[PDB]
RNA sequence: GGGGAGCAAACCGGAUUAGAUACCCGGGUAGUCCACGCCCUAAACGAUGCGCGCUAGGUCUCUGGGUCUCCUGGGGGCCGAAGCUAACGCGUUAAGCGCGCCGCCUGGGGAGUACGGCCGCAAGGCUGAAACUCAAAGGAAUUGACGGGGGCCCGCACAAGCGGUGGA
RNA sequence: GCAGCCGCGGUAAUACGGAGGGCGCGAGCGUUACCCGGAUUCACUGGGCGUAAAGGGCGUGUAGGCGGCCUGGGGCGUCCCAUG
């Protein structure tokens, strides 16, 4: 069964730049668009729209990614290094706000989920509150 | 300029009718104390002709390295199959951290403070080999900005 | 056992100049002129290539030989030089340059460290008004390092401080040598400093 | 120059032995053939000429290499038509990593071809003779063209790309732009710059190349 | 308890051999087939727990639907991108990228033993230590040698031939 | 005879025993014993199971763990503030 759906995305996500494609699809979800929405203003994707596959609401997620190189292998650097859930299910994992973690010297993200909503550590920060912390990304 | 350190020397053995026909191994270190970094695995019957071997291979793999107040501006840890290592900058006072491997190529990266960890296989050559790739990946706040940009 | 025994061997042991005697380690002869080689019947011989310990090991020596100090105190120091902030090297040299007996040495008080000493243990030195004879004491920014009254008509002193007029002193010091008096203005920096060690070698000693 | 449409030429190539990666570059199947979208081919040439252009008038060189039998003859051709090195007969391994190893067989040839008009030829054995005519005769044939280097190339005009992929992986580790006449069985990954194309067919590497060479030609100005 | 053609532990003889309680030959009882009941282990092996999603294709093949020179679903194979792996290898039948959940490992030998309990008609099985003792045990690859392994090729190496030593 | 471990010693021992010399530390220096450490070698941080030790011989499902999209109530977990 599909047991934890942000997971998922982040693998696609993360599954399909390794193979340099455009544009991902993924089962659509208010809160997984809140996530999408985090990414693209935090500039790791283009950004998204809603659609339709054959009936079903999804989510295209839209990829972005560096230059070409030279020498051997121009395979371009990825925006998106590094990608995974911190808090999976099962061993779920909140943080206090003096907790919260400060992300590759600051160079990376961290998004949680907090009571006024879903934030990035800086915002959260700036915010005063602490949630569950969904995923580290550089 | 360039400055050699060697990382290390091996003798190797290649067998053969009647006798062990040997072969020695040299892994050397090059840099600027500014913050490129060579570093070559020189293969040659003769120690001090495969130093000298080394020190071509080297001086061609070199590695800019971006340097925070001689700090490394990220951490990272990087996976060499075997071995894994650990990076992580530090403030001005704490001195470079590690062993001999590790601090011989950051010593030449012109590294000041930082701090190291060798985990998994500690074979000198992954290691070493993973302490580049290492390096390789560093990236300042500046060339990541450039990189989400339009 | 405050070591004391064979000494412009040392200025020999680094191959680097050790003031250990003051005048003479100025004349043909800290050794080291004339006799570079380290000590022992296998001085004359090549020297294979330092292990990385080694040379962090003989830069920690060449440190502290030059403030002839029990490594024990040494260590301690540089154990509290960590506990402050800053840079844990810089301010390793300054506890190190801020010792009683060391003041006196630079304050021009004594042709030695080793002799300024005994001018402490035998107190000759007045701090802020107060003899003391503990050299391991801290001299504290603004104090007045001088000469006992009882000791200023000696022989020794007197014919040190004939010599002061013609060196300047530290330029974190100050002194009165018509009145055989100085100053401790601030803690010294290292870009002050003279001493021919690198401190990162020391600090990352200390981590082994 | 620039030319037309002549599509009378290059519509496609290869059966399904594809690769994937060039799925931008097709049209469709057709009798289980997959069809060049020339629209396309159009788009890439109007810059892989635009880069070559830039080359030729800034003076620089490029090597032609097609090992290939039916453009064997036309490399030749047109490198010799223009003011370039090229290499017919067969590749060999490190024309560019160790070009300065092999550089010396050049000078070998330089060094016999010598002893082919001095005296010294008969007046010394015929073992040997034979022995260094032999010399020649191979270098003449796989040197025909590599002659012309006095330096690393500018640039690698390709034929067949992934029968080249040596002389392809060269060029790709040493900086040196890649530009190649390759179809459906290439991995336009690592080509600087591609013309989508059928290859085998002399009438596509004969069009290609003329156009190519004819370019190079307008562009230094005889 | 029934059944018993063939095969065949043990066992009877035969030959082989320094010997043969074996490999070869001739016989032969349990057993092997059936019913009921017990035993329950195993290289019970893909030596690869179960379920869901995602990541280029090519080709052979079983099978189903389609507008069937092509498309589309399910299964079995071989090659193979990215990726992974100590390496061999793996590669949409994952040893890839991920979540759930269960089981199991934590140096070799001593030991799958000892002791204890459970189970069984018995044979035994499940669970399962330590003392002591050793600095290894171990995987995969390399180069070699080597094989009463293979392919190919040489030399008065054999064959073919003449002449001899071994005798006096 | 040494020895923590790999080992050293069978007439050329930087590895035994003395000596010269040297390094280290100094009223101390060694040794043994015991704690944490190195050991991400019990792995929460931070491990594994094709061949290296490791998937239960298979299934069935009990407790238990884990669980799809939209909207609302409650707010127990969870986060923030003050206070003891
Ligand atoms: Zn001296």
Same mark, same amino acid.
């Given at each position: 069964?599909?047991?934890?759906?942000?997971?998922?995305?982040?693998?696609?996500?993360?599954?399909?730049?390794?193979?340099?494609?455009?544009?991902?699809?993924?089962?659509?979800?208010?809160?997984?668009?809140?996530?999408?929405?985090?990414?693209?203003?935090?500039?790791?994707?283009?950004?998204?729209?809603?659609?339709?596959?054959?009936?079903?609401?999804?989510?295209?997620?839209?990829?972005?990614?560096?230059?070409?190189?030279?020498?051997?292998?121009?395979?371009?650097?990825?925006?998106?290094?590094?990608?995974?859930?911190?808090?999976?299910?099962?061993?779920?994992?909140?943080?206090?706000?003096?907790?919260?973690?400060?992300?590759?010297?600051?160079?990376?993200?961290?998004?949680?989920?907090?009571?006024?909503?879903?934030?990035?550590?800086?915002?959260?920060?700036?915010?005063?509150?602490?949630?569950?912390?969904?995923?580290?990304?550089? | 300029?360039?400055?050699?350190?060697?990382?290390?020397?091996?003798?190797?053995?290649?067998?053969?009718?009647?006798?062990?026909?040997?072969?020695?191994?040299?892994?050397?270190?090059?840099?600027?104390?500014?913050?490129?970094?060579?570093?070559?695995?020189?293969?040659?019957?003769?120690?001090?002709?495969?130093?000298?071997?080394?020190?071509?291979?080297?001086?061609?793999?070199?590695?800019?390295?971006?340097?925070?107040?001689?700090?490394?501006?990220?951490?990272?840890?990087?996976?060499?199959?075997?071995?894994?290592?650990?990076?992580?900058?530090?403030?001005?006072?704490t001195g470079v951290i590690a062993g001999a491997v590790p601090r011989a190529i950051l010593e030449l990266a012109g590294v000041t403070d930082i701090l190291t960890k060798e985990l998994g296989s500690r074979n000198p050559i992954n290691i070493a080999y993973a302490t580049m790739e290492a390096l390789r990946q560093l990236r300042?706040?500046?060339?990541?900005?450039?990189?989400?940009?339009? | 056992?405050?070591?004391?025994?064979?000494?412009?061997?040392?200025?020999?042991?680094?191959?680097?100049?050790?003031?250990?005697?003051?005048?003479?380690?100025?004349?043909?002869?800290?050794?080291?002129?004339?006799?570079?080689?380290?000590?022992?019947?296998?001085?004359?011989?090549?020297?294979?290539?330092?292990?990385?310990?080694?040379?962090?090991?003989?830069?920690?020596?060449?440190?502290?030989?030059?403030?002839?100090?029990?490594?024990?105190?040494?260590?301690?120091?540089?154990?509290?030089?960590?506990?402050?902030?800053?840079?844990?090297?810089?301010?390793?040299?300054?506890?190190?340059?801020?010792?009683?007996?060391?003041?006196?040495?630079?304050?021009?008080?004594?042709?030695?460290?080793?002799?300024?000493?005994?001018?402490?243990?035998?107190?000759?030195?007045?701090?802020?008004?107060?003899?003391?004879?503990?050299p391991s004491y801290r001299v504290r920014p603004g104090d007045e390092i001088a000469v006992a009254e009882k000791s200023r008509n000696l022989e020794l002193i007197r014919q040190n401080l004939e010599a002061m007029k013609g060196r300047?002193?530290?330029?974190?010091?100050?002194?009165?040598?018509?009145?055989?008096?100085?100053?401790?203005?601030?803690?010294?920096?290292?870009?002050?400093?003279?001493?021919?060690?690198?401190?990162?070698?020391?600090?990352?000693?200390?981590?082994? | 120059?620039?030319?037309?449409?002549?599509?009378?030429?290059?519509?496609?190539?290869?059966?399904?032995?594809?690769?994937?990666? #060039? +799925?931008?570059?097709?049209?469709? %199947? /057709?009798?289980?053939?997959?069809?060049?979208? *020339?629209?396309?081919?159009? $788009?890439? =040439?109007?810059?892989?000429?635009?880069?070559?252009?830039?080359?030729?008038?800034?003076?620089?060189?490029?090597?032609?290499?097609?090992?290939?039998?039916?453009?064997?003859?036309?490399?030749?051709?047109?490198?010799?038509?223009?003011?370039?090195?090229?290499?017919?007969?067969?590749?060999?391994?490190?024309?560019?990593?160790?070009?300065?190893?092999?550089?010396?067989?050049?000078?070998?040839?330089?060094?016999?071809?010598?002893? #082919? +008009?001095?005296?010294?030829?008969? %007046? /010394?054995?015929?073992?040997?003779?034979?022995? *260094?005519?032999?010399?020649? $005769?191979? =270098?003449?044939?796989?040197?025909?063209?590599?002659?012309?280097?006095?330096?690393?190339?500018?640039?690698?005009?390709?034929?067949?790309?992934?029968?080249?992929?040596?002389?392809?992986?060269?060029?790709?580790?040493?900086?040196?732009?890649?530009?190649?006449?390759?179809?459906?069985?290439?991995?336009?990954?690592?080509?600087?710059?591609?013309?989508?194309?059928?290859?085998?067919?002399?009438?596509?590497?004969?069009?290609?190349?003329?156009?190519?060479?004819?370019?190079?030609?307008?562009?230094?100005?005889?």
């Open positions: 069964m599909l047991t934890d759906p942000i997971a998922d995305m982040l693998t696609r996500i993360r599954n399909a730049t390794r193979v340099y494609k455009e544009s991902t699809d993924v089962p659509a979800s208010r809160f997984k668009e809140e996530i999408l929405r985090i990414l693209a203003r935090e500039g790791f994707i283009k950004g998204y729209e809603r659609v339709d596959v054959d009936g079903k609401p999804y989510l295209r997620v839209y990829l972005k990614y560096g230059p070409r190189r030279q020498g051997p292998d121009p395979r371009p650097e990825q925006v998106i290094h590094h990608i995974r859930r911190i808090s999976k299910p099962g061993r779920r994992v909140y943080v206090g706000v003096k907790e919260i973690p400060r992300v590759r010297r600051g160079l990376g993200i961290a998004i949680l989920s907090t009571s006024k909503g879903v934030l990035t550590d800086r915002e959260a920060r700036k915010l005063g509150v602490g949630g569950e912390l969904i995923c580290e990304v550089w | 300029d360039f400055e050699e350190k060697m990382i290390l020397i091996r003798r190797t053995a290649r067998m053969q009718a009647g006798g062990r026909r040997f072969r020695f191994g040299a892994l050397v270190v090059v840099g600027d104390r500014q913050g490129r970094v060579g570093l070559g695995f020189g293969k040659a019957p003769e120690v001090p002709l495969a130093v000298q071997k080394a020190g071509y291979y080297a001086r061609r793999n070199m590695v800019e390295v971006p340097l925070q107040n001689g700090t490394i501006p990220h951490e990272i840890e990087v996976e060499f199959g075997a071995s894994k290592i650990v990076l992580k900058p530090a403030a001005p006072g300042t706040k500046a060339d990541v900005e450039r990189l989400r940009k339009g | 056992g405050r070591y004391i025994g064979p000494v412009c061997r040392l200025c020999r042991r680094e191959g680097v100049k050790l003031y250990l005697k003051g005048e003479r380690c100025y004349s043909p002869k800290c050794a080291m002129e004339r006799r570079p080689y380290p000590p022992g019947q296998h001085g004359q011989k090549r020297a294979r290539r330092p292990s990385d310990y080694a040379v962090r090991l003989r830069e920690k020596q060449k440190l502290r030989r030059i403030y002839g100090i029990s490594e024990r105190q040494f260590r301690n120091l540089f154990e509290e030089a960590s506990k402050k902030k800053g840079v844990t090297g810089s301010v390793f040299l300054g506890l190190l340059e801020s010792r009683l007996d060391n003041v006196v040495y630079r304050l021009g008080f004594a042709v030695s460290r080793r002799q300024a000493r005994q001018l402490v243990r035998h107190g000759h030195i007045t701090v802020n008004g107060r003899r003391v004879d503990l300047k002193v530290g330029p974190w010091l100050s002194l009165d040598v018509e009145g055989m008096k100085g100053k401790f203005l601030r803690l010294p920096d290292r870009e002050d400093l003279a001493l021919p060690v690198n401190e990162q070698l020391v600090i990352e000693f200390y981590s082994r | 120059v620039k030319e037309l449409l002549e599509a009378g030429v290059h519509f496609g190539h290869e059966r399904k032995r594809w690769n994937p990666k #060039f +799925a931008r570059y097709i049209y469709a %199947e /057709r009798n289980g053939i997959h069809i060049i979208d *020339l629209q396309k081919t159009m $788009e890439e =040439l109007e810059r892989t000429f635009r880069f070559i252009e830039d080359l030729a008038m800034r003076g620089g060189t490029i090597l032609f290499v097609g090992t290939k039998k039916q453009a064997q003859d036309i490399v030749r051709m047109e490198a010799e038509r223009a003011g370039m090195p090229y290499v017919n007969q067969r590749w060999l391994g490190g024309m560019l990593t160790n070009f300065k190893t092999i550089s010396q067989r050049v000078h070998r040839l330089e060094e016999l071809e010598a002893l #082919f +008009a001095s005296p010294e030829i008969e %007046e /010394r054995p015929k073992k040997e003779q034979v022995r *260094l005519k032999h010399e020649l $005769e191979r =270098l003449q044939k796989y040197l025909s063209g590599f002659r012309l280097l006095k330096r690393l190339p500018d640039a690698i005009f390709v034929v067949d790309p992934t029968k080249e992929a040596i002389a392809v992986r060269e060029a790709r580790k040493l900086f040196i732009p890649v530009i190649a006449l390759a179809d459906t069985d290439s991995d336009p990954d690592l080509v600087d710059y591609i013309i989508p194309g059928n290859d085998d067919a002399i009438r596509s590497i004969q069009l290609i190349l003329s156009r190519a060479v004819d370019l190079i030609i307008q562009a230094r100005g005889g």
